[PDB]
Amino acid sequence: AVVKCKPTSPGRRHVVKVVNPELHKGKPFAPLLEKNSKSGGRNNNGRITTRHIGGGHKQAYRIVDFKRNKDGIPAVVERLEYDPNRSANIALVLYKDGERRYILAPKGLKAGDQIQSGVDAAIKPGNTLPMRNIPVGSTVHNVEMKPGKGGQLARSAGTYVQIVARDGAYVTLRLRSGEMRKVEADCRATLGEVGNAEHMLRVLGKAGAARWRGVRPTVRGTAMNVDHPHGGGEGRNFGKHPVTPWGVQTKGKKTRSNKRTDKFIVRRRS
RNA sequence: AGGACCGAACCGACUAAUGUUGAAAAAUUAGCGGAUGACUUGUGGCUGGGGGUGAAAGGCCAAUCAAACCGGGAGAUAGCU
RNA sequence: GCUCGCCGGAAGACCAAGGGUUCCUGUCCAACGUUAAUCGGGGCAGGGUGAGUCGACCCCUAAGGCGAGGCCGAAAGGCGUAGUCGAUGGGAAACAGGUUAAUAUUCCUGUACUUGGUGUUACUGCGAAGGGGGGACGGAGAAGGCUAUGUUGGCCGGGCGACGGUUGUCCCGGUUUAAGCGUGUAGGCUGGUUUUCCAGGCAAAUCCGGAAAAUCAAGGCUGAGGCGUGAUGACGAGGCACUACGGUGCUGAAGCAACAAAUGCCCUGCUUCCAGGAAAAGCCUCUAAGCAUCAGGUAACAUCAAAUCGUACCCCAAACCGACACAGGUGGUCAGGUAGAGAAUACCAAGGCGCUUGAGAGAACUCGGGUGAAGGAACUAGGCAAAAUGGUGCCGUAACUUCGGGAGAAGGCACGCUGAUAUGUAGGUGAGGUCCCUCGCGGAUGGAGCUGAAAUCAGUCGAAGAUACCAGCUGGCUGCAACUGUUUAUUAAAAACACAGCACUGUGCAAACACGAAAGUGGACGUAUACGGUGUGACGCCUGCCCGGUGCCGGAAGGUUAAUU
RNA sequence: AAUUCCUUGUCGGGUAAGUUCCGACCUGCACGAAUGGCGUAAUGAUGGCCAGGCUGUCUCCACCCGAGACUCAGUGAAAUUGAACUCGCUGUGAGAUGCAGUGUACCCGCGGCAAGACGGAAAGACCCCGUGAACCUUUACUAUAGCUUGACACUGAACAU
RNA sequence: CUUUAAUGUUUGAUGUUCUAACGUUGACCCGUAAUCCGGGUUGCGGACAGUGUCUGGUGGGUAGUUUGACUGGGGCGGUCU
């Protein structure tokens, strides 16, 4: 639930938490865990490729199954769990054969609900079927863009895409960004929405709350000397067009220079 | 419960005096700040010079930084001493 | 040798790193020592470092490094797979006492433990470069139960006091003892046992997981400490023979109990929280191909082996880093006594020091401090500095406010000692004894003994009772920034930088973007409630007019227009 | 006003006396609404200001305890230094120990002050010069990485218009 | 030779389709106890994309440079035959 803390101290006035008693108050399933060494925004060369990244709280990787290729075997939800590697919560399921796996937790899922993957599955949240069998005008998540590789769209907290049409071997979708894309009509998609919608109402309330996530502080550039176009000056001058480091606009300039697909795009956005 | 309160260690370094061929190539003395945290610290590792890193001061990169050090071009050039 | 003074959560003791003989002894004093020097971390010579259990090596791996092939790249070379290296982490075993001028858990004494090899005997399904389990893990907080250790008492030994008193409720000292083995408690976790069955764990599996039944509820795992054993021993204040008064043999009393009590152990526990908490091996199991009167496996007994290197000395320092025997810097461990909340502070113990120039004098002036008539900031750029405040308990406490604060607001009263209440109370601990029993490290009852505040009344001393050290000045108006934080190592700690929060914008995943000639990596094992960039900078009321100019995003009728032809 | 030149703006508060400070007026030289505007409890080794207490901050210094300074013994530096038999005054040459004139002055030390020796220290950082630099900015010049446009090549087959 | 249409060859423009180059940081098999790489099957894209050469535009993102003299100091102004 979305709860507002009390201002007993500076650092708790504007903080807002998202707690859920339905989550597992213990350790997760170990066989589905693996190391996750932090990077710091650096690469194999040791250079900072992405800034504002470093430190934070340790994490272990929850092996998630975005493919959902176990068809013809129902599984029931054992327990919900909190995943640090992502914003949404996951769910530990148990397959009749004794196989346990993690999946994204949809909107209205609990511990004990049944779900199944495949073309012969039922139309209920949590089930995975190819969009060829999914009706038109529905709401799905963890959508696949190529059959066999795994869901890649609508994997976030409260994200969901809506199927808009299906002409042939392709189906048109309106992604959460407002984009109207079309993918093959054989890509597996999951029914329902990822349930953490209140995740966006969360509020850090203090700086250190961001440093736990691994986010390092951000320095603007206006008072930045040889180091950034904006640079400096006696006072707050900034008498030039807003520009990135390395010299690009950042306030309207489109940088889509792929031009490979150019087919699935219909209503890019806005 | 807490980037909460007082306050040692620990980490810092606001004021004054001394010292200024000093005890010390930035410290001492008396006070001062934080002190469960964006904390602190050991060991090892990565980032290499028009580059790195930088909660950004043109700050730090071995007492050296508006472009490190060493060697080489090199007996640079100097209408100036 | 006798006094004095200093440190004593260190200026004591044990180590790592580092240094590398500075360690012990003898001998020497030119230079080195900021003086002298018979002395020395000096010079010369000699001596000294003993390990199956400590550590390294070794097995395992993190970050990350190298990297067969391979991909990429003018050459150089770069990235990287399989693999192989790499601790600051995981992994088998030793304690006490004694001993040397210098070493010892390494030697001696006594008592133990661990992993292996081999052999004998008996019983036998053994088997991996695979599977599974386990190893294996956060922060804060709450207590409870123990010990280290300490205090008092008792006991044993000695003592009867340089000056009044001291055979007594007196004084001093001692009152220690391990690993391991046996017991398995406080307490923590878990529901167990048997059988059948299955799309799972690459294949297999009796193992793990899962499913459906029967059958019982006590079963097991973990576990500080305690007791006993170890120990008729060792140690032991002191003696007795020697005693070059350096010390060597022998002998050697008591060696208990209560109370208090940790920041350590139970505890990798319990509870709770969001920021959601390493890996791999050893170890326990499972089977595969294969081997079965074999080989291997299990238990006992015997025997053998456990190599190699380090081990001296310093280690908050005169031995390391600072050119110095330099007020500096340097990580971890042990953590006594009185008062105290306390690792502050004051005084002491253990133990270690008095800091490698002294003597005398008692002018100016300087440094560091103390006191001060009357006045009390009139000083000064400025209350710089100094002075002052300073504690616990109770009462009391404004505007303003985001209702949390402000706040320790301000302010005011009381604090010692003795006695009684109560020969030491409430409370805490808990004996013998008694009763029960699943008869045990059990439960109940029992309250001796020990320990022990706080308060009231009364009385009493002093100028002064929070008497030392220690230990907030307070209040008001107001600018800036929300706040905690960060920064110009070495003249600037701020109104600057961050900041949570807001907005614009880009980004549909082989994402944008970035480092890279490229491969590729990061972004991210993330997917628009995400990521990047820019500006603003909590919260609250708000954020107005202008697209002519530049830029950005779009569009077309035409014109202009590159290579090319 | 962290912004106001005129300027110590005018009035008022507070002080015996207030260029600062506080509160209003607006005549905003030259505030202004996310390079944000106006407020804001709390916080701050933050800036400014007013009181109480407090005191040697001062009026106005005085004494005292210690460490140096002073003397003795021992060891034993340094910056600086053209050479010195190294006075004042006035004038002169452009601020005289050294010239002129004149005055004064026995020789040599110790302890103190710091006016001068344009004292020591650092080939002035300010100013200017140089057809010296180095960094930084931009609608300065010329190039360039990158991004982007198209032609040709890697690159072919049909069909229809 | 002045002339004009269905055809034939001829080449060019636009559009649709296809697959065989090429791409695949999709799936599966092997090398192979290997998320590298390659090969193989197959699917999706598909002569687009991407790369090489040429070329226009943009290009302080980055380099190499310029930015006068006289002057009652220099600058501003003025001046330069």
In this structure, the dihedral spanned by the alpha carbons of residues A241, A247, A251 and A257, taken in order and rounded to 10 degrees, is 150
Same domain, A79 and A122: no
Same domain, yes or no: A5 and A107: yes
Domain count, chain A: 3
Shared-domain flag, residues A124 and A71 = no
Last residue within a domain, chosen from A168, A194, A220: A194
Task: Name the residue closest to E50, CA to C1'.
Answer: A260
Of A72, A91, A113, at which residue does a domain stop? A113
Q: Are residues A25 and A121 in the same domain?
A: no
Any strand C atom closer than 7 Å to A204 CB: yes
Q: Which domain holds residue A68?
A: 1-113
Question: Residue A108: which CATH number?
Answer: 2.40.50.140
Place of tokens 């959902």: A68
Q: Are A73 and A121 found together in one domain?
A: no
Residues A41 and A98 occupy one common structural domain: yes
At residue A242, what is the residue type? P
Would the Cβ of A218 be found within 7 angstroms of any atom in strand D? no
CATH number at residue A254: 4.10.950.10
A178/A172 Cα distance (integer angstroms): 12
Q: Which two tokens stand for residue A196?
A: 């953490």
* A174 is near strand C: CB distance < 7 Å: no
Q: Solved how?
A: cryo-EM
Distance A228 CA to B74 C1' (A): 37
Q: Are A103 and A194 in contact (CB under 8 A)?
A: no
Task: Label the pairing between strands A151-153 and A143-144.
Answer: antiparallel
Boundary (domain end) residue, out of A158, A173, A194: A194
Q: Is strand D in 7 Å reach of the CB of A237?
A: yes
